[PDB]
Amino acid sequence: VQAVAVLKGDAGVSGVVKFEQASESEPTTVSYEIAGNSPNAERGFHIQEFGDATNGCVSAGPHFNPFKKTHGAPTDEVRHVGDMGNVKTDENGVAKGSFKDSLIKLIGPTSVVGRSVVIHAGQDDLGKGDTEESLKTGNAGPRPACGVIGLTN
Amino acid sequence: VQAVAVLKGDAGVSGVVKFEQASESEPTTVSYEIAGNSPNAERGFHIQEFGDATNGCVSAGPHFNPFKKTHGAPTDEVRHVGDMGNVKTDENGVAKGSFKDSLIKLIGPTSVVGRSVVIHAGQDDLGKGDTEESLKTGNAGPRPACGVIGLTN
Ligand SMILES: [Cu+2]
Ligand SMILES: [Cu+2]
Ligand SMILES: [Zn+2]
Ligand SMILES: [Zn+2]
């Protein structure tokens, strides 16, 4: 199964995020290419609960969290399903890479198809900040771009 | 279950399409408000197979047709699942209305969540044209706007 989300916004940030999962038990491979970010920085990269784009990136809701856990790093055992951590941007402000994740799925009851992907304006503190907000959003700041994860071939 | 698709494009046409289905066996209620169309006209309104927006509205593919039937009117027994027919536009070029459909579903194997909705530039001939194209696209023309159907609450 394949899916793709085209990140758009009014802040100069844009990109494409591709997802791939052969079967439900398998990890999903997330590939991304995002431009227009601050150069040489880490930026919060998360999957939101809804794919509602009626009010910009705001209507996408909070991080996809079906198991009701606190915000964390992708490698943390306690993290939201949509917690993809930070993506690094180069001297030209482009973030490009890929990784596999075993909580994010394109198949089954927790499928992220129809939900949104958000690239943040700030860095994700990975749930390590001494704040309640750290456990909710990782304090990653505004959402300059987002896109609904749609089906593809 | 609720879903929404925000129709956008570079041709002045835009809008919102809302979907609602309580349970799989139930019809889905499609509500729409679309502006920027030709005034006092009928325009093809369809659901495409993919929600891939990487190449404008083109990457969405053909009409969602899991049962491999020919193009038809929504009331036809032989139609594509994504065949929503034409929507009427008023003297100001706005198409606004709602209807229920029993082939379009937000739940189950034929769910349209993650797929795209397209508003056409031309009228749908409802599969009655004396052309092979009539049985494929209804000859509805270009796709000025489209949006990926995402989950909402
Ligand atoms: Cu976030
Ligand atoms: Cu069409
Ligand atoms: Zn989170
Ligand atoms: Zn059709």
Residue located via tokens 């053909």: B62
Q: What is the residue extent of each domain of chain A?
A: 1-153
Q: What residues of chain B lie within 8 A of the CB of A53, using their CB?
A: 4, 6, 147, 150
Q: Determine how many CB atoms are found less than 10 A away from the CB of residue B128.
A: 15
CATH 2.60.40.200 is held by the domain A1-153 = yes
Beta bridge partners, B103, equal none
Select from A31, A106, A152 the residue whose CB has the most chain B CBs within 10 Å, as the one to mutate to test that interface: A152
User: How far lies A67's CA from each of A71, A126, A131, B3, B84, in Å?
Assistant: 11, 18, 21, 22, 37
Give A-chain residues touching B50 at CB under 8 angstroms.
Answer: 150-153
Alpha-carbon span A86 to A74, nearest angstrom? 9
Residue A78's nearest CA partner among A138, A141, A143 is: A138
The DSSP letter of residue A38 is: P
| B89 contact A CB<8A | no
Residue A113: name the closest of A63, A152, A146, A57 by CA.
A152
Beta-bridge partner residues of A29:
A20, A100
Nearest C-alpha neighbor of B112 from the set B43, B56, B65, B57: B65
Residue A27, classified by CB atoms within 10 Å of its CB into exposed (0-12), middle (13-18) or buried (19+), is middle
Tell me the H-state helices in B12-83: none
* Residues 6 or more apart whose Cβ sits within 8 Å of residue B59: A152, B50, B52, B53
Distance CA A6, CA B57 (A): 12
φ/ψ (deg, to 5) at B16: -140, 135
What count of Cα atoms within 13 Å lies in the side-chain half-sphere of residue A85? Answer: 15
Residue where the block lists tokens 């041709």: B11
| Candidate from A52, A59, A151 with C-beta closest to B114 | A151
Structure resolution, Å: 1.8
CB contact at 8 A, B50 and B116: yes
**Closest partner residue to A152 among B6, B16, B52, by Cβ?**
B52
